[PDB]
Structure formats: C-alpha cells, structure tokens
C-alpha cells in the first residue's frame, strides 16, 4: 500500500492460471510432426514450459500461439494436452479480439483534428505529415489496429497480442473452452511469464499491489519495467486498458512500452518525482523461485 496513496494489495488463489506465449513467424524451421515451440540448447523454452507445468500441477498453464502451422505441428500440440492435463494451448485464431479494436483511420483523424485545432505555429508539423501520409497509404485493404500488427511488425506482433491476451486473462482459458479447468471463473486473473522464466519451486499465492505487478530489471544502476512478467488480479485490469487507451490514441505507440509500462504509470499517477526506482520496487513482481530472464545470459530468442 505504498505511496503516494494507499493501494490494496491483492491475493489470488493457487488456482491462478499461468500464461506462456509463442509466436512463430517461421513454422517451417521445425519439423512437421513435432512441437513448433523452440528449445535450442541456448534457449530451452519449450523445456521451461514443460518444467513449470509439472511443478504447479494444481495450477493451469496456458500457451498462446500464432503462426501458419502445419497440421502435424497442431497434432503435436494436441498430444501435449493429453500428456499434461494442466497444459492448455490457445491460438490467436480462436479468440475474439474485436472489442479491443480501433480502426486505423480514426486514430489518425483524431490526431489530425487535435493537431489542427492549435494554430499553424503550435502544431507538430512533421507529425501531421506522417499522419496524412499514413492515412492515405494505410487506406489500401483493411484498417484495423489488430491487422496493423503482423509478422512484419515482428517485434510488435507478439507484444501487442501479449497485451490482448492479458486483457482477456482468465477469460482466455474459458473462451477457448479448454478442458480440465473447473477451478476458476470469469473475471479471474492470470500470470504471464516469458519462457526465459525458470521456476524452481511452486509459488503459492502472491500479493501484488493493485491487482497488477510486472518484471523489473536493475542494470547498471537503473530499473525499468519489463514485460517478462505480467501479473493481473483481473481480466481487463484498468492499467492495461489505460495502456490500450494509448494504443488507441498515441500514433506509432509501442505496445511493449506504452501498452503496459505507460499504462501502469498512468494508473498509479507516477509522474514524475516520484523517483522511479522505488516505484519500480513498488510495482516489481518479486519472487525467490523464478530466474529472470534467461535470455540475458545467452542470445535473445530473436536472433543475434
Ligand atoms: O520468436 C519468438 C520469440 C519470443 N517470443 C516470446 O518472447 C518471449 C522470449 O523473448 P526473449 O525474452 O527471449 O527476447 P528478449 O526480450 O530477451 O529480447 C517468449 O516467452 C515468447 O513468448 C515469441 O513469441 N516468439
Ligand atoms: Mn529474455
């Protein structure tokens, strides 16, 4: 309940689901009868998702996947669901995301109109150029903020859908009609981790500040919020909607930074002094049974 105000720390049952996501631009990389989840010796991601499941057998574990997968890879996913009742694998194709949409044309026009109100001296001139050009070009085909996020966004593809999935949260397991899940109810929470996260011992219940907590990394002497960990009390947690509000309003907004980090700041009215590091300590998702993030030591799943 730290400052400025008093915030009700929340606690959610062991029956809180866990969420993993794998978005693969290149399903051809893997074979056509095995799992399209990567586990290089450098980055044993699928192995980490398997290790987590075992431990928290009681808890649900979900995987959010998208890409154009070959049937034997889908058949392979179907097998793992048999192997572990606690694992569910949800596809982007199977979830309605329409409610969270805002068509690209409106975003630009509202920015144009707002920019046009102020006088010619005050207006952002370069921004208006970019807006009108974007409006004319983006016309071709289909104008949806979700459609805007494709494999070619690359980084954007999963980051934005990461926020969509967390917005759905518990509802996501319910929405897919994944089975063996009679623990939880709509308007129930869920925890996202990167496959970078290795889980030593089952975590039990956790107190998070206002129904949300996120990953924090402190190097060299500075901390910034990270999307490796996202914990929510709730489906549709107000910090994410506020982040989505940026997604709907701010031009060229980054889902990683604006969608969440900015949303959280908004919710707790951080700015600005308000020294960050302690605020990062306040928001920080802390646990002694998780290693984070294990891409740090080797090479990020994104090649380099
Ligand atoms: O091709 C990829 C690579 C990564 N990820 C997601 O991003 C996380 C791992 O990214 P990583 O942390 O290794 O990259 P970094 O953020 O360190 O650059 C995983 O949990 C995946 O959910 C993905 O969906 N597709
Ligand atoms: Mn990582």
Author numbering: 30 to 333
Paper text:
The non-LEE encoded effector protein B (NleB) has GT activity and inhibits NF-κB activation by transferring N-acetyl glucosamine (GlcNAc) to host death domain-containing proteins and to glyceraldehyde 3-phosphate dehydrogenase (GAPDH). The T3SS effectors SseK1 and SseK2 from Salmonella typhimurium SL1344 are NleB orthologs that behave as NleB1-like GTs, although they differ in protein substrate specificity. Here, by using a combination of X-ray crystallography, STD-NMR, enzyme kinetics, molecular dynamics simulations, and in vivo experiments, we show that these enzymes are GT-A fold retaining GTs that most likely follow an SNi mechanism.
We solved the crystal structures of Salmonella enterica serovar Typhimurium SL1344 SseK1 in complex with UDP. Point mutations (C39S, C210S) were introduced into SseK1 to prevent protein precipitation due to irregular intermolecular disulfide binding. However, in the sandwich-like π-π stacking, the interaction modes of SseK1 and SseK2 are slightly different. In contrast to SseK2, Trp331 from the C-terminal lid of SseK1 interacts with the uracil base instead of Phe203 (second and third panels). While the Kd measured for binding of UDP-GlcNAc to SseK1 F187A was similar to wild type SseK1, the Kd for binding of UDP-GlcNAc to SseK2 F203A was increased about 13-fold as compared to wild type SseK2. These data suggest that although the sandwich-like π-π stacking interactions are maintained, the uracil binding modes within SseK1 and SseK2 are slightly different. The conserved arginine residue in SseK2 and SseK3 (Arg348SseK2, Arg335SseK3), which is located in the lid domain, is substituted to an alanine residue in SseK1 (Ala332SseK1). In the crystal structure of UDP-bound SseK1, the backbone direction of Ala332 is located at the opposite side of UDP. This implies that the lid domain of SseK1 is likely more flexible than SseK2 and SseK3. The arginine on the C-terminus participates in an interaction with UDP-GlcNAc in SseK2 and SseK3, but not in SseK1. Based on this result, the departure of the leaving group is likely to be easier, due to a weaker enzyme-substrate interaction network in SseK1, than in SseK2 and SesK3.
